[PDB]
């Protein structure tokens, strides 16, 4: 009924890979594979456990029976870095695996922080978002702590991450801490310490409101 796939994987160009999708109960050879990149629609890659759809490059090959299956790719290209989803097409109810996003590996890039204190039109509107940006870093797991008046926050801050870039393959994050006019005017310092796979020391950015 279910289908088991791990989430991510990071590889280089040329590298060889194998996305394993296992199954709970046995399906024989009624597993299929699909490839989908952002804002786009799923393109069927493999089906019949091992049978390449039409138009599929020879680096792609399916393999495997019973309960466990494999999408193996030969050498890797700029284009193959998508998300591959497996699908059980054996039972009455086709089932999908959670998907495996292949992203491009590369050399560490410590993020360069930015802390845009609130505007004015917002403050006068009734609230206040505080934007702490992180430009071009890798890997993608950069942590951001929000501190107010030396107090540790949690719940009021929302983060977001740009999809990996084709050219330099980096990431850019963006934490946005929103508060209420009053709430906001009743605190001095505003920093966001960032710990990152690239920084031996968490970098801090801040500004004492009303300045």
């Amino acid at each position: 009924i279910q289908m088991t796939q791990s989430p991510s994987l990071s590889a280089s160009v040329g590298d060889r890979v194998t996305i394993t999708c296992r199954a709970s109960q046995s399906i024989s050879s009624y597993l299929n594979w699909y490839q989908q990149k952002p804002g786009k629609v799923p393109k069927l890659l493999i089906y019949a456990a091992s049978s390449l759809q039409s138009g599929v490059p020879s680096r792609f090959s399916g393999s495997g029976s019973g309960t466990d299956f494999t999408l193996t790719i030969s050498s890797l290209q700029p284009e193959d870095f998508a998300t591959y989803y497996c699908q059980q097409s054996y039972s009455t109810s086709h089932t999908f695996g959670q998907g495996t996003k292949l992203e491009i590996k590369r050399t560490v890039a410590a993020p360069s922080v930015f802390i845009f204190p609130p505007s004015d039109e917002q403050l006068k509107s009734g609230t206040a978002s505080v934007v702490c940006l992180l430009n071009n870093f890798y890997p993608r797991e950069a942590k951001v702590q929000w501190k107010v008046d030396n107090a540790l926050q949690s719940g009021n801050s929302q983060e977001s991450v740009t999809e990996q870039d084709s050219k330099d393959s980096t990431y850019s994050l963006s934490s946005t801490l929103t508060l209420s006019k009053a709430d906001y005017e009743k605190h001095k310092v505003y920093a966001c310490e960032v710990t990152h796979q690239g920084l031996s020391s968490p970098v801090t950015k801040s500004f004492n409101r009303g300045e």
Partner: protein, 216 residues
């Protein structure tokens, strides 16, 4: 060749229902096995259920039983997806594929946002460039778009001109109900007192094309 044509984007209140088309203009129908898969924001595909005309009956996956109903009116070569008792996690891009296994061709999708909030153009605020917005010879401004509904909202700078180093972040869903995002553009420090910086946000679901200008 054969094409799947799905219905228009829908904004149903957290409780309404919803039926979706998915016309098929290619060759046959009768045998093409239609299937309905939905995909929440940055989430795996999720097979809601499929069917086969010539056989009329369909089956739906467990959690979707009782509240879902997919039909097909071959006399029109179309398929219909019926989803009742709506909640907030039912929000997503609904696809209807075909396979006449494997599952060849798919549709363009369908955006059904469910949430107890009404449409609304977004505000717009200058993420002004100052001391705490630079390093080396690079300063970076940006535009904070906020409180709109539903998706999506485009953002072009200097009306298409500016193209390099502009990160238009993904949207963010808020407790409030409305989404929000922003677009920073890390440009040259020097180029501040010299060039003009204006972002072009636009939210057509509410006919809007606000324009602001970031400055120090």
């Amino acid at each position: 060749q054969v094409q799947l044509l799905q219905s228009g984007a829908e904004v149903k209140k957290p409780g309404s229902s919803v039926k979706v088309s998915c016309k098929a203009s290619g060759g046959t129908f009768s045998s093409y096995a239609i299937s309905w898969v939905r995909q929440a924001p940055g989430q795996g595909l999720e097979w809601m259920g499929g069917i086969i005309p010539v056989f009329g009956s369909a089956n739906y996956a467990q959690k979707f039983q009782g509240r879902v109903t997919i039909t097909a009116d071959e006399a029109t070569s179309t398929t219909y997806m019926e989803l009742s008792s709506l909640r907030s996690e039912d929000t997503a891009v609904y696809f209807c594929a075909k396979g006449g296994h494997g599952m060849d061709v798919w549709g363009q999708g369908t955006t059904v946002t469910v949430a107890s909030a009404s449409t609304k153009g977004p505000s717009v605020f200058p993420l002004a460039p100052s001391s705490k917005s630079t390093s080396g010879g690079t300063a970076a401004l940006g535009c904070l778009v906020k409180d709109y509904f539903p998706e999506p909202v485009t953002v072009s700078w200097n009306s298409g001109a500016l193209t390099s180093g502009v990160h238009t972040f993904p949207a963010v869903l808020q407790s409030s109900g409305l989404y929000s995002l922003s677009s920073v553009v890390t440009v040259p420090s020097s180029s501040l007192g010299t060039q003009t910086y204006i972002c072009n946000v636009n939210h057509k679901p509410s006919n809007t094309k606000v324009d602001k200008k970031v400055e120090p």
